[PDB]
Design an enzyme around this catalytic site. Structure first.
Site, PDB file in Angstrom:
ATOM      1  N   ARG A 204       0.603   3.113 -35.481  1.00  0.00           N
ATOM      2  CA  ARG A 204      -0.815   4.266 -35.492  1.00  0.00           C
ATOM      3  C   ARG A 204      -0.269   5.158 -34.508  1.00  0.00           C
ATOM      4  O   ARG A 204       0.582   4.610 -33.404  1.00  0.00           O
ATOM      5  CB  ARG A 204      -1.963   3.603 -35.113  1.00  0.00           C
ATOM      6  CG  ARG A 204      -2.793   2.826 -36.439  1.00  0.00           C
ATOM      7  CD  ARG A 204      -4.147   2.554 -35.935  1.00  0.00           C
ATOM      8  NE  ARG A 204      -4.095   1.366 -35.211  1.00  0.00           N
ATOM      9  CZ  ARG A 204      -4.224   1.347 -33.979  1.00  0.00           C
ATOM     10  NH1 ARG A 204      -4.401   2.438 -33.283  1.00  0.00           N
ATOM     11  NH2 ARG A 204      -4.299   0.059 -33.137  1.00  0.00           N
TER      12      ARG A 204
ATOM     13  N   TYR B 200       2.964   5.350 -42.763  1.00  0.00           N
ATOM     14  CA  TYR B 200       2.455   4.038 -42.174  1.00  0.00           C
ATOM     15  C   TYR B 200       1.161   3.509 -42.428  1.00  0.00           C
ATOM     16  O   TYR B 200       0.218   4.515 -42.415  1.00  0.00           O
ATOM     17  CB  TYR B 200       2.763   3.839 -40.521  1.00  0.00           C
ATOM     18  CG  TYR B 200       2.055   2.339 -39.986  1.00  0.00           C
ATOM     19  CD1 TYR B 200       2.818   1.321 -40.116  1.00  0.00           C
ATOM     20  CD2 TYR B 200       0.822   2.631 -39.426  1.00  0.00           C
ATOM     21  CE1 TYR B 200       2.251  -0.044 -39.547  1.00  0.00           C
ATOM     22  CE2 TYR B 200       0.140   1.393 -38.699  1.00  0.00           C
ATOM     23  CZ  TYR B 200       0.830   0.272 -38.952  1.00  0.00           C
ATOM     24  OH  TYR B 200       0.294  -0.961 -38.248  1.00  0.00           O
TER      25      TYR B 200
ATOM     26  N   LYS C 135      -8.767   2.018 -41.446  1.00  0.00           N
ATOM     27  CA  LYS C 135      -9.084   2.234 -40.412  1.00  0.00           C
ATOM     28  C   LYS C 135     -10.073   3.773 -40.356  1.00  0.00           C
ATOM     29  O   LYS C 135     -10.999   3.701 -39.802  1.00  0.00           O
ATOM     30  CB  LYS C 135      -8.025   2.446 -39.191  1.00  0.00           C
ATOM     31  CG  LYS C 135      -7.219   1.000 -39.383  1.00  0.00           C
ATOM     32  CD  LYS C 135      -7.990   0.239 -38.849  1.00  0.00           C
ATOM     33  CE  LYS C 135      -7.091  -1.090 -38.202  1.00  0.00           C
ATOM     34  NZ  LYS C 135      -7.729  -2.159 -37.554  1.00  0.00           N
TER      35      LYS C 135
ATOM     36  N   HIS D 142     -14.479  -3.851 -35.694  1.00  0.00           N
ATOM     37  CA  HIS D 142     -13.238  -4.280 -35.847  1.00  0.00           C
ATOM     38  C   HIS D 142     -13.186  -5.807 -35.593  1.00  0.00           C
ATOM     39  O   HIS D 142     -12.862  -6.382 -34.574  1.00  0.00           O
ATOM     40  CB  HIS D 142     -12.172  -3.538 -34.834  1.00  0.00           C
ATOM     41  CG  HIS D 142     -10.850  -3.862 -35.037  1.00  0.00           C
ATOM     42  ND1 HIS D 142      -9.802  -3.738 -34.100  1.00  0.00           N
ATOM     43  CD2 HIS D 142     -10.045  -4.323 -36.104  1.00  0.00           C
ATOM     44  CE1 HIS D 142      -8.597  -3.918 -34.491  1.00  0.00           C
ATOM     45  NE2 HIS D 142      -8.730  -4.264 -35.638  1.00  0.00           N
TER      46      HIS D 142
ATOM     47  N   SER E 164      -5.911  -4.903 -31.600  1.00  0.00           N
ATOM     48  CA  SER E 164      -4.944  -4.813 -32.447  1.00  0.00           C
ATOM     49  C   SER E 164      -3.825  -5.827 -31.800  1.00  0.00           C
ATOM     50  O   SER E 164      -3.580  -5.686 -30.577  1.00  0.00           O
ATOM     51  CB  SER E 164      -4.443  -3.286 -32.789  1.00  0.00           C
ATOM     52  OG  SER E 164      -5.534  -2.473 -32.994  1.00  0.00           O
TER      53      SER E 164
ATOM     54  N   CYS F 227      -4.033  -9.244 -31.559  1.00  0.00           N
ATOM     55  CA  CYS F 227      -4.606  -9.967 -30.383  1.00  0.00           C
ATOM     56  C   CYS F 227      -5.036 -11.326 -31.047  1.00  0.00           C
ATOM     57  O   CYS F 227      -5.502 -11.997 -30.308  1.00  0.00           O
ATOM     58  CB  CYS F 227      -5.498  -9.372 -29.559  1.00  0.00           C
ATOM     59  SG  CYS F 227      -4.759  -8.304 -28.203  1.00  0.00           S
TER      60      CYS F 227
ATOM     61  N   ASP G  97     -10.181  -8.101 -40.734  1.00  0.00           N
ATOM     62  CA  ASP G  97      -9.967  -7.133 -39.747  1.00  0.00           C
ATOM     63  C   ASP G  97     -11.140  -6.290 -39.449  1.00  0.00           C
ATOM     64  O   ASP G  97     -11.495  -5.414 -38.393  1.00  0.00           O
ATOM     65  CB  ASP G  97      -9.021  -6.030 -40.328  1.00  0.00           C
ATOM     66  CG  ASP G  97      -8.298  -5.224 -39.412  1.00  0.00           C
ATOM     67  OD1 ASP G  97      -7.745  -5.455 -38.230  1.00  0.00           O
ATOM     68  OD2 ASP G  97      -8.538  -3.842 -39.675  1.00  0.00           O
TER      69      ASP G  97
ATOM     70  N   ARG H 101       4.571  -5.642 -41.057  1.00  0.00           N
ATOM     71  CA  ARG H 101       3.227  -6.116 -41.844  1.00  0.00           C
ATOM     72  C   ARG H 101       3.619  -6.494 -43.163  1.00  0.00           C
ATOM     73  O   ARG H 101       4.587  -6.074 -43.982  1.00  0.00           O
ATOM     74  CB  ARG H 101       2.378  -4.668 -42.066  1.00  0.00           C
ATOM     75  CG  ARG H 101       1.965  -4.079 -40.747  1.00  0.00           C
ATOM     76  CD  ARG H 101       0.726  -4.668 -40.073  1.00  0.00           C
ATOM     77  NE  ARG H 101       0.449  -4.363 -38.638  1.00  0.00           N
ATOM     78  CZ  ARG H 101      -0.711  -4.554 -38.067  1.00  0.00           C
ATOM     79  NH1 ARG H 101      -1.717  -5.237 -38.639  1.00  0.00           N
ATOM     80  NH2 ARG H 101      -0.871  -4.148 -37.052  1.00  0.00           N
TER      81      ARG H 101
HETATM   82  N1  LIG Z   1      -0.136 -17.327 -27.752  1.00  0.00           N
HETATM   83  C1  LIG Z   1      -0.933 -16.889 -28.886  1.00  0.00           C
HETATM   84  N2  LIG Z   1      -0.398 -16.136 -29.662  1.00  0.00           N
HETATM   85  C2  LIG Z   1      -1.102 -15.694 -30.856  1.00  0.00           C
HETATM   86  C3  LIG Z   1      -2.554 -16.509 -30.963  1.00  0.00           C
HETATM   87  N3  LIG Z   1      -3.180 -16.034 -32.112  1.00  0.00           N
HETATM   88  C4  LIG Z   1      -2.088 -15.056 -32.638  1.00  0.00           C
HETATM   89  N4  LIG Z   1      -1.171 -14.600 -31.877  1.00  0.00           N
HETATM   90  C5  LIG Z   1      -0.170 -13.822 -31.960  1.00  0.00           C
HETATM   91  O1  LIG Z   1      -0.558 -12.483 -31.730  1.00  0.00           O
HETATM   92  C6  LIG Z   1       0.177 -11.699 -32.722  1.00  0.00           C
HETATM   93  C7  LIG Z   1      -1.048 -10.942 -33.318  1.00  0.00           C
HETATM   94  O2  LIG Z   1      -1.822 -11.704 -34.034  1.00  0.00           O
HETATM   95  P1  LIG Z   1      -2.838 -11.096 -35.274  1.00  0.00           P
HETATM   96  O3  LIG Z   1      -3.834 -12.362 -35.830  1.00  0.00           O
HETATM   97  O4  LIG Z   1      -2.009 -10.711 -36.324  1.00  0.00           O
HETATM   98  O5  LIG Z   1      -3.561  -9.941 -34.556  1.00  0.00           O
HETATM   99  P2  LIG Z   1      -4.663  -9.005 -35.125  1.00  0.00           P
HETATM  100  O6  LIG Z   1      -5.891  -9.250 -34.349  1.00  0.00           O
HETATM  101  O7  LIG Z   1      -5.016  -9.577 -36.562  1.00  0.00           O
HETATM  102  O8  LIG Z   1      -4.074  -7.652 -35.310  1.00  0.00           O
HETATM  103  P3  LIG Z   1      -4.360  -6.381 -36.381  1.00  0.00           P
HETATM  104  O9  LIG Z   1      -4.066  -6.918 -37.512  1.00  0.00           O
HETATM  105  O10 LIG Z   1      -3.429  -5.193 -35.931  1.00  0.00           O
HETATM  106  O11 LIG Z   1      -5.845  -5.867 -36.180  1.00  0.00           O
HETATM  107  C8  LIG Z   1       0.809 -12.492 -33.787  1.00  0.00           C
HETATM  108  O12 LIG Z   1       2.041 -12.426 -33.847  1.00  0.00           O
HETATM  109  C9  LIG Z   1       0.686 -14.053 -33.452  1.00  0.00           C
HETATM  110  O13 LIG Z   1       1.555 -14.765 -33.455  1.00  0.00           O
HETATM  111  C10 LIG Z   1      -2.950 -17.571 -30.081  1.00  0.00           C
HETATM  112  O14 LIG Z   1      -3.699 -17.946 -30.369  1.00  0.00           O
HETATM  113  N5  LIG Z   1      -1.955 -17.816 -28.882  1.00  0.00           N
HETATM  114  O1  LIG Z   2      -3.766  -1.483 -36.045  1.00  0.00           O
HETATM  115  C1  LIG Z   2      -4.725  -2.334 -36.226  1.00  0.00           C
HETATM  116  O2  LIG Z   2      -5.549  -2.720 -35.500  1.00  0.00           O
HETATM  117  C2  LIG Z   2      -4.351  -2.971 -37.550  1.00  0.00           C
HETATM  118  O3  LIG Z   2      -3.487  -2.528 -38.236  1.00  0.00           O
HETATM  119  O4  LIG Z   2      -5.058  -3.905 -37.911  1.00  0.00           O
HETATM  120 MN   LIG Z   3      -4.597  -8.618 -38.680  1.00  0.00          MN
HETATM  121 MN   LIG Z   4      -6.857  -4.002 -36.867  1.00  0.00          MN
END
Ligand SMILES: Nc1nc2c(ncn2[C@@H]2O[C@H](COP(=O)(O)OP(=O)(O)OP(=O)(O)O)[C@@H](O)[C@H]2O)c(=O)[nH]1
Ligand SMILES: O=C([O-])C(=O)[O-]
Ligand SMILES: [Mn+2]
Ligand SMILES: [Mn+2]
Ligand SMILES: [Mn+2]
Length: 620
Positions: free
Chosen positions: A85, A233, A242, A262, A284, A286, A309, A403
């Site tokens: 983004r 993207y 989004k 979100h 995002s 996280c 999401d 992704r």
């Molecule tokens: N250390 C740690 N890392 C984590 C944990 N959970 C997720 N991660 C890492 O953080 C990164 C983001 O995790 P996602 O679950 O894909 O994040 P998201 O909130 O779904 O992000 P968006 O899809 O962009 O909204 C990943 O590469 C995970 O490996 C956790 O509990 N501890």
């Molecule tokens: O950017 C973000 O939060 C996503 O792609 O979910």
């Molecule tokens: Mn996600």
């Molecule tokens: Mn997201």
């Protein structure tokens, strides 16, 4: 009805009929076909035969590659400039700026980019005329939420990218049945173009059609229009996600009395046979996807995924906060996904899945950092840059924001009510972000108004999901900073007003931090599957267990209230340490931020919580 035809695009339709379209839909198609001048028009029906032709097309144009190791999986490699983004080029157009963002006291607003109609007219007329020459315009009728459901919202996206069509088939409910459900009703107008008219003036990188210089993602909530140019993207081109389900929908939710957030939605079941649903807003990249698909390490516990999401929430007649997931699939971050961190994701992405910007193995598989699987001898890796890659280089083999795009119905732990049009009842809301220091593992808000303040005070390290670098700790209230569709002060008052609802069963509000580190720089909490131990404590708190201790920042678990069996090595002192020196600086930064960015639109109840927290910390 015409003097030279000229405006009748029936002869350019290669699938479907303009006669079969509703009146307002045909006007939208033909009006932009006149402006963008596409060579062909394809009205999508969402069929399996259509998806097959779109894949073979993209494969013949060198846009995607088949991953022969899996069942119907494909890999797309993009221009390195079109990978995430772009918040600085994502604008909202309203008559008054105050409807979009609060008027800041000093600097510029970080809560959204406002642009006048007059300025956007010039930007629109400099990009879209003739932008689809030589290309096909696809007409995507799609639904956000279960088809035919009254709460579902329907849109039409026009795009010149088959990659967008194939992804929208996974991420939304699209095809002929949506046009039949829409009828003469209202729909969200979505117009997208890669901005690369034929013949090509510039050579493309990895056959990826994009126009980085002119990229602009615009939102016109008063006109129910989303207009996106230059980017392929997913966050910029899948306009139902989004742009529609968060930015546009958050304003409709404010107008109609619901919420668009979100947030993930999960169901958790305890060994006593009781099940509760929880929502969680993390920024995002996280942890939302990893938490919503978690494989718990506690026996007798089960997590099921409603969505990962976006959540659309509304109070029902009984006063329960009910949530639905308007999406039809998962658009998740690939790096870090392994059998040990997210095994339920691994099971899901092995069929009918489109990967973007991950590495390809010579035997037809995928690879990325953190996959934690060794390769067989002789297997070579090709990076996302379409180059040979060795494990002893500096460039990662997969882009940090790469992704997967996979259907939700393939997830082994998909919740049986994930398509229920009545929604699931939410009993708890979780906030949290990447804080390497100061913020304890979990605490509970003192009230609804304190919980809204906790969401408003969220801060987190920057990630690869947008254009921010340096891992600098930014403000991201409610994990919604890049996604607010209207004034953030009014968003806070909207959240606060829910405590005025008659017979409202307000959920509990928690704040977590999986990312706190020690003096050495390593994580203090194992996370992932072990986060079930934190969810167990929240479950008991919702049931009313007396397992909390009062602190200046909220309630924290009592001593020996968390199940830490099987760990023991956890330095519990540093996981819940509350430093007065840290928190005195934290409230100062929250004060300066809220005063400057929200200014005269800051609700008094938020300021009162700020003053209360500042007082409790001074008494330490
Ligand atoms: N250390 C740690 N890392 C984590 C944990 N959970 C997720 N991660 C890492 O953080 C990164 C983001 O995790 P996602 O679950 O894909 O994040 P998201 O909130 O779904 O992000 P968006 O899809 O962009 O909204 C990943 O590469 C995970 O490996 C956790 O509990 N501890
Ligand atoms: O950017 C973000 O939060 C996503 O792609 O979910
Ligand atoms: Mn996600
Ligand atoms: Mn997201
Ligand atoms: Mn109030």
């Amino acid at each position: 009805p015409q003097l030279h035809n000229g405006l009748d695009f029936s002869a350019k339709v290669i699938q479907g009929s303009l006669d079969s379209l509703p009146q307002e839909v045909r006007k939208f198609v033909e009006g932009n076909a006149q402006l963008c001048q596409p060579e062909y028009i394809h009205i999508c029906d969402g069929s399996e035969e259509e998806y097959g032709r779109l894949l073979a097309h993209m494969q013949e144009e060198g846009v995607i590659r088949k991953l022969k190791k899996y069942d119907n999986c494909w890999l797309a490699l993009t221009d390195p400039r079109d990978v995430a983004r772009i918040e600085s080029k994502t604008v909202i157009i309203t008559q008054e700026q105050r409807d979009t963002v609060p008027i800041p006291k000093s600097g510029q607003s970080q809560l959204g980019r406002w642009m006048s109609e007059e300025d956007f007219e010039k930007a629109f007329n400099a990009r879209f005329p003739g932008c689809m020459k030589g290309r096909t315009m696809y007409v995507i009728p799609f639904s956000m939420g279960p088809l035919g459901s009254p709460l579902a919202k329907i849109g039409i996206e026009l795009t010149d990218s088959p990659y967008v069509v194939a992804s929208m088939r996974i991420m939304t409910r699209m095809g002929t049945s949506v046009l039949e459900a829409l009828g003469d009703g209202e729909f969200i107008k979505c117009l997208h173009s890669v901005g690369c008219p034929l013949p090509l003036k510039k050579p493309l990188v990895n056959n990826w059609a994009c126009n980085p210089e002119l990229t602009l993602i615009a939102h016109l909530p008063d006109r129910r229009e989303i207009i996106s140019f230059g980017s392929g993207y997913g966050g910029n081109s899948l306009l139902g996600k989004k742009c529609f389900a968060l930015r546009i929908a958050s304003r409709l939710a404010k107008e109609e009395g619901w919420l668009a957030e979100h947030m993930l939605i999960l169901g958790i079941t305890n060994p006593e046979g009781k099940k509760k649903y929880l929502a969680a807003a993390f920024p995002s990249a996280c942890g939302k996807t990893n938490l919503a698909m978690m494989n718990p390490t506690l026996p007798g516990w089960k997590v099921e995924c409603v969505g990962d999401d976006i959540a659309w929430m509304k109070f029902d007649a009984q006063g329960n906060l009910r949530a639905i997931n308007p999406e039809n699939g998962f658009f998740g971050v690939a790096p870090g996904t392994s059998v040990k961190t997210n095994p339920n994701a691994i099971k899901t992405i092995q069929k009918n899945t489109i990967f973007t910007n991950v590495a390809e193995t010579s035997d037809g598989g995928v690879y990325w950092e953190g996959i934690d699987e060794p390769l067989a001898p002789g297997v070579t890796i090709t990076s996302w840059k379409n180059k040979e890659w060795r494990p002893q280089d500096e460039e990662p083999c997969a882009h940090p924001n790469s992704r997967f795009c996979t259907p939700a119905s393939q997830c082994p732990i998909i919740d049986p009510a994930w398509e229920s049009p009545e929604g699931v009842p939410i009993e708890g809301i979780i906030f949290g972000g990447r804080r390497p220091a100061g913020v304890p593992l979990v605490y509970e808000a003192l009230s609804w108004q304190h919980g809204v303040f906790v969401g408003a005070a969220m801060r987190s390290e920057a990630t690869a999901a947008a254009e921010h670098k340096g891992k600098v700790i930014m403000h991201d209230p409610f994990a919604m900073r890049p996604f607010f569709g209207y004034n953030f002060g009014k968003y806070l008052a909207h959240w606060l007003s829910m405590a005025h609802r008659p017979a409202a069963k307000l959920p509990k509000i928690f704040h977590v931090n999986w990312f706190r580190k020690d003096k050495n720089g390593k994580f203090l909490w194992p996370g992932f599957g072990e986060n079930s131990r934190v969810l167990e404590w929240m479950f008991g708190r919702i049931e009313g267990e007396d397992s909390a201790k009062l602190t200046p920042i909220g309630y924290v678990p009592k001593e020996d209230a968390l199940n830490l069996k099987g760990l023991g090595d956890v330095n519990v002192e540093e996981l819940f340490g509350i430093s007065k020196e840290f928190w005195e600086k934290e409230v100062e930064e929250i004060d300066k931020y809220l005063e400057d960015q929200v200014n005269a639109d800051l609700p008094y109840e938020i300021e009162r919580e700020l003053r209360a927290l500042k007082q409790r910390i001074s008494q330490m």
